[PDB]
Structure formats: C-alpha cells, structure tokens
C-alpha cells in the first residue's frame, strides 16, 4: 500500500530485454515505458530471474505455507519433488523397455499436468431467489480454476492422511494419482461437474 498508483509492476523476464530489436510493436511500448517517468515497484523476494522456478510452484508453496514458515513450505515442496522423482525412477527401472519411452520422470511437467487434470471446468454460485439458495452453474475464470485445483489437493492431503505419513509422502502419491486421473481430487471434480449437470436447468437464474 506504500506504493502509489503511479508505480508499475516490474518485468522479470530477461529475454524480454535481451532482444528488443527482434520486433517493432514492443519497441513502441518499451520506449515510452520510461519516458512517462513511470516508477517501478521493488522486486518481491519470492520472484526472481532463476530458470528453475515456476509461478505455479511458487503459488502452491505459498498456499501450503502455514503462518510465516516459508522455509518449511519450501522444504516441503522440495521434499515432495524429490519423492516424486525417486518414485518415478523406481518405476522406470522396474519397468521394461517399452514403458520407459512412455513414463515421465520430470516432476514439473507431471505437477502441471496433474493440476490441469484436477482443474474444474465450471463451478457453482449460490444465488438467493424466492428466499432459497440455488447452486447455479457458472463458468469459472482461469485463476479461480487453478486456485480451486490447488486448494482441493491441499485440503485432501492435509486431512485425509495418517499421522505417521508425512506431507511430502502423501503429496507424492496424490500427484501421481491426479496425473493418472485416479485421485480423490479427480473424484471431487467429477462430483462438482455432476452437480452442475444436475443444476443446469437453473442456469437461467444467472444475470451475467
């Protein structure tokens, strides 16, 4: 809030500035970006120019963080990635030659694919009409869909596990199940879709 309305969000992509001469449309904007005396906010500590970080991973770590233990959240994320990598390597080495060309060991791509698989398509909005609340089906925004996809998995893995089982160990199994379209997160997404299909006849209640 200390930054005034004139402050603009910084650009972290280095390739955006490394080759400004490859296109002319961006030139007209980046030449007047600084001419208008546009002040730029400080770069956040979470976001950097490293190539091994992803905004999706950062958002998931922030959502998993409890209170202010960002170090603990980062350690949990790293342990989950290590666990999924090792579990994929074990299956890669236990499988035959034909399955090795199909099984994937990269944790980032399987994490993104699992998140997309567990992303809902449409959601429900409670609308009050006639003194009663109806769950009207409604298209969801991209950010809302991604947040719901992350939140469902986080809530399931925080509560539906045994005390002896650790968070990275549970998350490693859940990510694989979601990637293979077998997890309770996928079941919850299907339940939401079925509820929306049941309440589709109430979609006329929406006014936007």
């Amino acid at each position: 809030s200390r930054y005034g309305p004139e402050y603009k969000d910084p650009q972290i992509d280095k390739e955006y500035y490394r080759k400004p001469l490859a296109e002319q449309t961006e030139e007209e904007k980046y030449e007047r970006d600084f001419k208008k005396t546009q002040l730029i906010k400080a770069a956040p500590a979470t976001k950097t120019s490293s190539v091994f970080e992803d905004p999706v991973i950062s958002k998931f770590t922030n959502m998993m963080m409890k209170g202010g233990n960002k170090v603990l959240a980062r350690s949990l994320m790293t342990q989950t990635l290590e666990a999924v990598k090792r579990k994929q390597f074990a299956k890669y080495h236990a499988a035959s030659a034909e399955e090795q060309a199909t099984i994937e060991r990269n944790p980032y791509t399987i994490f993104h694919q699992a998140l997309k698989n567990c992303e809902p398509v449409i959601g429900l909005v409670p609308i009050l009409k006639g003194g009663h609340f109806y769950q009207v089906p409604v298209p969801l925004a991209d950010r809302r869909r991604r947040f719901l996809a992350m939140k469902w998995m986080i809530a399931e893995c925080r509560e539906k596990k045994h005390r002896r089982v650790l968070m990275p160990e549970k998350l490693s199994q859940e990510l694989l199940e979601a990637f293979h379209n077998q997890g309770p997160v996928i079941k919850r997404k299907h339940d939401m879709h079925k509820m929306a299909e049941a309440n589709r006849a109430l979609a006329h209640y929406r006014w936007w």
Partner: protein
C-alpha cells in the same frame, strides 16, 4: 491599507539596517539569505511548522495583494467594467477577445491578398510550457477567481493560439505560460574508482526493512561473495536468500566476472538479503552500459522497498487486527 504598507516598508528598512549593524555584516550587501539566517540564530524557535517560525520579509510578501481604489472623489469608477463584479478578469477576457478578432480580421485580409507568412507557434513541447493554474491566475488578478471562468479563459487562450499568431499576440500569450521542471528519472551513475592499484572497484549502498548493506565490487576477480568475513553459502543457509543474491548477477550475466564483499547489519535473514541485493544492484551500475541499468531499474533492482512494519495502534492488536467486537 495603502499607508499602512508604506509605513511597514520604512519600518522594515530600518529593521534591516539595525539587523545588519548588530550582526556585523555590510548593510549594502545584506540580503534575504542573510536576513533569514540571522533571524534563525537570534530567535531559534524550534517548531515543526515553518510558517510559525519568526520571519522578517518585505511587506509585499507578508501582506497579500491589496485591491486598489476603484472610484475617485466624485464616486465615478475608473475602469469601465467596474459594475461587472470582476473588472480585472472581465477586462482581460475583453482584451483577449479583441485581440482574437484582430487576428481573425488580419488573417482574412491576408487570405484575400493570398499571402501566408505566419507559422505554427503553438507547439511548445520541447520548451515544456504549461498553462496557468487557478492560484497563479489569482496571483496576477487581485480579485478572486472561479473554476468555470478560468476554464473559459483557458479555452479562449487555446482558441487564440490555434489561429495564425501575430507579432504582438505571441508575447501576450507567452506571459500566461509556465515552465515545467525536468521529469527525467535517470539516476546518477558512480564513476569507476581505482584505489590501491585495484582496477574496476565500485561501491553501493542499500536499505530494506531496517537493514543497511554496503557492498564493494571488484570487476577483475572471480565470482564470489564475502559477507561479514564469511562466505555467502554459510551466511545464508536458505536457498531463497542466495537466490536474492543471484537475482542481480543473473540479470546481467556477470555471475563469474565480479568479486563482491558485503557488510550488512540489522533486520532478519530476508531483510539482509533484500538490502544486499539492492546494494549490489546499485553498485553494479558502474560496470554496465546505460542500456541495461535502465532494464534493471525497470525490473525493480534499483528501487527501494518502502514496505516497513506499521506502528501498532492503541485499542488494536497488530495495527490492523481489532478486538473482538461484540454486537450485544
């Protein structure tokens, strides 16, 4: 109050002579930058408001512009627009309209004669000219002003400027123009320094969340950081803190081309990491061209972080958390 200001002028002159005599400076060379300096010493009033401090200026600055007499001894008003309420603003509007009509008729005659000698003298972008503000116009015209009349005057001035400018019209329209200050936000680049037969030596300072960091960078050594006498790996066990160090160097691709020594105090781990990142970014400006320092400042490396913890308020918990408000 015409005689009162005149008497105050003589009293101010006498007081200026006395102040110069008692301070010991030459009264002939005594000016306002000495008057205020001597006042601040003789009457050291410590107050937060500057206008509450003792001040001795010429009466024309202290007293506001007093309205001149409008009618003679016989009661006849001097100006012909006295009964219009605003005899200065309306006279100015009448003169502007008369000059606009003169310009229009002269341009019509010139077009009839088929002559074009005027040019476009309305584009003053390189000069940096602007129109007068309401307060500036109220300074020129002793009488009070409004918003609608000021807008009408500005819209008539732009109409006049949109026509082929004359010889005497440009000087009249220029007296309502004001120069703007430089809006350049380009920072000052420290020159490369050579101390104790050491080449490519620079220094930078950074502050973030009660953390002060001073970083010295040598452009001839290998890539390594020495913080508080220990290596950065030992001083920052957290990978995010080391990513803060990597953020400026990776943007300039100078990971293994500069050796940096930092001294940071105050704050926590993240505050120290931010302070050293800011100091390193500010120090690296000397070793890079002017094209990439602007890229760093647009990426957010050369700007401070004003996010400081707010003071706790009475009756609250954390300056935002209110107590449990019971409705009944």
């Amino acid at each position: 109050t015409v005689d009162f200001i005149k008497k105050q002028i003589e009293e101010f002159n006498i007081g200026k002579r006395h102040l110069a005599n008692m301070m010991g400076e030459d009264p002939e060379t005594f000016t306002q930058e000495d008057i205020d300096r001597a006042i601040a010493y003789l009457f050291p009033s410590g107050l937060f408001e500057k206008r509450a401090r003792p001040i001795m200026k010429h009466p024309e600055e202290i007293f506001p512009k007093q309205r001149a007499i409008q009618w003679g001894e016989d009661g006849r008003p001097f100006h012909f627009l006295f009964y219009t309420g605003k005899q200065s603003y309306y006279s100015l509007m009448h003169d502007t309209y008369g000059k606009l009509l003169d310009v229009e008729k002269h341009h019509n005659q010139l077009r009839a004669k088929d002559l074009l000698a005027e040019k476009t003298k309305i584009l003053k972008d390189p000069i940096g000219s602007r129109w007068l503000i309401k307060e500036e116009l109220e300074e020129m015209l002793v009488e009070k002003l409004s918003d609608q009349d000021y807008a009408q005057f500005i819209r008539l001035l732009e109409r006049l400027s949109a026509l082929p400018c004359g010889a005497t019209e440009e000087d009249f329209v220029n007296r309502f123009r004001r120069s703007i200050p430089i809006q350049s936000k380009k920072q000052l680049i420290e020159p490369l320094q050579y101390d104790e037969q050491g080449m490519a030596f620079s220094r930078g300072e950074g502050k973030r969340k009660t953390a002060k960091a001073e970083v010295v960078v040598y452009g001839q050594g290998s890539g390594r950081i020495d913080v508080n006498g220990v290596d950065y790996l030992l001083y920052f066990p957290v990978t995010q803190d080391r990513e803060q160090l990597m953020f400026p160097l990776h943007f300039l691709d100078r990971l293994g081309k500069h050796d940096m020594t930092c001294a940071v105090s105050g704050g926590g781990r993240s505050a120290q990491a931010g302070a050293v990142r800011l100091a390193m970014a500010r120090a690296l400006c000397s070793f890079v061209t002017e094209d990439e320092v602007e890229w760093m400042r647009q990426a957010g490396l050369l700007t401070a972080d004003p996010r400081v913890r707010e003071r706790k308020k009475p009756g609250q918990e954390g300056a935002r958390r209110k107590f449990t408000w019971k409705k009944r």
